[model samples]
Target: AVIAFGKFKLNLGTREMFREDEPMPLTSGEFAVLKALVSHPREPLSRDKLMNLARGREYSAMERSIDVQISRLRRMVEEDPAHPRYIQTVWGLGYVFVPDGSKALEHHHH
Candidate 1:
């Protein structure tokens, strides 16, 4: 299945993010976090949860630094990181991707 948000699309089959059929340069970790977020759809995932899903238990210390990855992601996916439209921070919780800056049920995995 493929998950799409804004002008970007993530192909789970190939595990890549694309903009208008052009593959973007997403590092492995960026793709991992994007997959996790797309896997959960509208659900808000905490920093620890994101860290575990994307990095694993060995990188437990990275729980607090997920922000760095998130920041990098926003820079790529978001037109403006300060006011992101796709990967918006959920204030004290974590981040949430609202596909197209609105609710979407048709493309969700769960």
Candidate 2:
């Protein structure tokens, strides 16, 4: 399945991302992280939850590393990584995927 969000198209079958027509390469870990995020758009996913969703169980040691992968994803897609639009942090929660690139408000309690 191909998931389309903004200018990016994620091919789940091939595990590849495309910006417009060009392929935006992603590491295996990066792809997994992205896949989890994209799969649940508009919902905040904690680092531990993301890790489990992406890599499965027994990965409690690499909780902080998820931040690095998120950074890389922002660098790849965000025009300005400093103030990201697509991948926004949820403060104490974790991160959320904003497919429309809207200005997501903090503390999304729904």
Candidate 3:
């Protein structure tokens, strides 16, 4: 299905984010994070949980993989990764997609 917001479009079936006619380059892990947030935006998911989500539930790590991947995710989803528009930091918590329910439902109509 096609999910639109401003110029952005996410095709759930295709695992792609786009700007109308153009395909946005994203890694598998990035798409996974975005997809998870699509259904549950702004609900802070912990780094451990995110790591499991990004890797697998059985996967384990001591490194800050979630934070590193989130930084990479920022570059993909945010126009300004440094100033982030969609994914927001949660201080001691993990991360959240800043767009609310209605905003998540809105479309840019590609």
Candidate number achieving the greatest lDDT relative to the actual structure: 2
lDDT of 1 at 70: 89
So what's the TM-score on candidate 3?
Answer: 0.74
Residue 20, candidate 1: Cα error in Å is 1.5
- Model 2 Cα shift for residue 69 (angstroms): 1.0
lDDT of 1 by residue, 1-110 (tens): 98877788888778877898898877888889888888887778878788789878534544556888889889888889989887878876788777664762333575
Residue 30 Cα positional deviation in candidate 1, in Å, after optimal superposition: 0.5
Per-residue error (Å), model 1, residue 37: 1.0
TM-score of each: 0.82, 0.83, 0.74
Task: Please write out the lDDT profile of model 2 over residues 1-110, one tens digit for every residue.
Answer: 89987678899889988898788788899889998988887878888889889988644544678888899889988888999888889887788888784554445476
Clashes of each: 0, 0, 0
Candidate 1: the clashing residue pairs are none
Order the candidates by lDDT, highest first — what do you get?
2, 1, 3
Candidate 2 displacement at residue 50 in angstroms: 0.3
Worst 10 residues of 2 by lDDT: 101-110
lDDT, residue 1, candidate 1? 91
Pick out the ten consecutive residues of candidate 1 with the lowest summed lDDT. 101-110
RMSD of each: 4.9, 2.9, 7.5
Q: After superposition, how far is residue 63 of candidate 2 from its true place, in Å?
A: 4.1
